[PDB]
Structure 1
Amino acid sequence: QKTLHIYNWSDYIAPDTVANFEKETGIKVVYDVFDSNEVLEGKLMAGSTGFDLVVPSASFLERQLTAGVFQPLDKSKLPEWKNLDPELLKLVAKHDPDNKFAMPYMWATTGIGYNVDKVKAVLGENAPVDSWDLILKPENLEKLKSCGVSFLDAPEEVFATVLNYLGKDPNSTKADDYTGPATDLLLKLRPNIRYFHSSQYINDLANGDICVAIGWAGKVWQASNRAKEAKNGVNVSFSIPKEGAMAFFDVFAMPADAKNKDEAYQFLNYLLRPDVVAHISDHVFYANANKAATPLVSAEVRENPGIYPPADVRAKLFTLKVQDPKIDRVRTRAWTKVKSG
């Protein structure tokens, strides 16, 4: 009896993906979920994960490669690799040289999810929902405080976002940028922030418990879809702000101690099927990295520029670089100071 252990982001797969793979291959898949790059990186660094496939963000995989926690993907076992978008493969190759270790799965941006009616009730019809001013300007957050503010629990994404908003290098290597202006702004906003979390804002946006959130595009679009299905009158939307935003690329990778390698390769080839990953995008509201799958994606997802952004928007996006030990320590210490309590 063949088995396969998969550790993937939560809400990152169609409800029937695994069942169809199981019935076609006869493999029993053990499936578990996470919502934090930090949780996954911690597991990879502390010892055996017990998984055959894991799905870190590409900028995190770059750090993890130097620890040897993955084994390189045998491209002769991934024949439809050519389905992947070349330009996106080129971009991930900055994190994963020669695309030796990482199979791009989905990608999206870290933007602003918001209740349309609540935000407009508080900040007016012309609320700057096109700008990080909506949530990074203290005077706006003080008014939104009453209706609920949520920051994502991803310190590298938040600090890069703040640095870009402050006109500085999103991957600044100047320590004073973090301890000074970045911390200053985050400490002004902190009293208005209800909580830091990477998943709860989905349901809180859907049910109307919060009105604004720094979050990932697909997660916010899922909340907007759940509110629509519940017919609760809640109107959630997502914004890639005009000042730019962080893009991320989540990639499948194979731990160096994976037990069921053959099964894991069968699962990766299953995900390379254009119809397979297009069907996933239809349910999770994330853009996949498969260029052959794009015309198979539903028009609701494919034509949403908050999911498949056009060249105008993509040119203003930035990606995370891996910081040195000093900046990493200073950023981690400031995050702790910000999440205090």
Structure 2
Amino acid sequence: KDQELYFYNWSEYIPSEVLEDFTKETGIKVIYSTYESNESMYAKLKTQGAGYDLVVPSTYFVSKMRKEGMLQEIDHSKLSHFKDLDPNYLNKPFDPGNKFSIPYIWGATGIGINTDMLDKKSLKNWGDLWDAKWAGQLMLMDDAREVFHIALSKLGYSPNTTNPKEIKAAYRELKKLMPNVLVFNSDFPANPYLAGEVSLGMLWNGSAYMARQEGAPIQIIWPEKGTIFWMDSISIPAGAKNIEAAHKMIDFLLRPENAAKIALEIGYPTPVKTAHDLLPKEFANDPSIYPPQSVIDNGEWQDEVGEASVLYDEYFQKLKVN
């Protein structure tokens, strides 16, 4: 007990060296595995029931998982770096008092573009991706809520709607986008842009930065309205066997030197205030990472949709198959 840790997380987030460092420091073996979406993570936790000590839901999955008895309370007294978290990302209605989730990574989705291949001024909004000239060229995120977010935004509906008529209208709108779609990728989304398989599509800010670090000219065009904002938080599954190890890993990732060093490698913003303050000006004011104020004001954080989540999934699965 607590000699190992079963950690299930998003791809891109933890460099291999970081896990080696954790094991070096604690003597705790990490059995690490990754996922590309909340929907894949969730389906896995439902099938297995137990088997994981840590999982990383986006904030729009936290309330659902708590209500379904899938999570357990996190002890803040075991997290010496809880004080380092930015208060602006804490104590939200999805998890009052952060009893079930700890802010870990926040990011945004815009339009990824290869500037050596295509023109920046030719795209300003999500709806521009529907243009006929993009036939068989786009990458979309492999994420039901993000893909529906862009169509709902295009239609002038809330990207967090629970209205089945609006969800169906977004599905019909997305069917018109499908001739422009080459791939759906949320696993290693920087890789199609790096390989030149795609020059345009949806892209996370972190993924675009990683592509730039490898020498590719991958920028982010921030849609004028409807830019997606999201946050991933760490949670402890209800059946966790290694609770002490789980808190040790959360605290290790909250450690400002770790959160800052990792942010510089993966290209994502951090909700750890102390770590954010350690970031160089070049990273902190990178326009493809941190959206301008107008983009923030006209964008939307991904929020829970309650039982309508099944409807988003059903239609997104239909889009991917047909």
| TM-score by shorter chain over 0.5 | yes
- Bigger mean CA deviation after superposition, 93-102 or 41-50: 41-50
- The counterpart of 2:217, out of the listed 230, 235, 243, is 235
Identity of aligned residues (%): 33
Amino acid at match of 1:340: V
Cα distance in 2, alignment partners of residues 109 and 98 from structure 1: 24
Q: Which residue of 2 aligns with 1:134?
A: 128
Q: Which residue of 2 aligns with 1:276?
A: 258
Cα distance, 1:46–1:220 mapped onto 2, change above 3 Å: same
Query: Does the Cα contact within 8 Å between 1:6 and 1:51 map onto a contact in 2?
Result: yes
Q: Which residue of 1 aligns with 2:86?
A: 85
Query: Does the Cα contact within 8 Å between 1:58 and 1:251 map onto a contact in 2?
Result: yes
2:31 counterpart SS class = strand
Query: Does the Cα contact within 8 Å between 2:36 and 2:142 map onto a contact in 1?
Result: no
Cα distance in 2, alignment partners of residues 49 and 306 from structure 1: 39
Amino acid at match of 2:138: V
Amino acid at match of 1:134: D
* TM-score under structure 1 length normalisation: 0.87
1:161: Cα distance to partner? 2.2
Q: Which residue of 2 aligns with 1:259?
A: 241
* 2:170 is aligned with 1:171: no
Amino acid at match of 2:133: K
* 2:178 is aligned with 1:190: yes
1:40 counterpart SS class = helix
Amino acid at match of 1:173: T
Alpha-carbon RMSD:
2.0
Q: Which residue of 1 aligns with 2:276?
A: 294
Amino acid at match of 1:131: N
Cα distance in 1, alignment partners of residues 313 and 4 from structure 2: 38
1:56: Cα distance to partner? 1.3
Q: Which residue of 1 aligns with 2:68?
A: 67
2:116 counterpart SS class = helix
Amino acid at match of 1:162: A
Cα distance, 1:77–1:39 mapped onto 2, change above 3 Å: same
Q: Which residue of 1 aligns with 2:41?
A: 40
* 2:287 is aligned with 1:335: no
Query: Does the Cα contact within 8 Å between 1:281 and 1:301 map onto a contact in 2?
Result: no
* 2:5 is aligned with 1:4: yes
1:331: Cα distance to partner? 2.8
Query: Does the Cα contact within 8 Å between 1:119 and 1:144 map onto a contact in 2?
Result: no
* Stretches of structure 1 lacking an aligned partner (at least 5 in a row): 229-233
Cα distance in 2, alignment partners of residues 221 and 113 from structure 1: 10
Amino acid at match of 1:103: I
Cα distance in 1, alignment partners of residues 269 and 50 from structure 2: 27
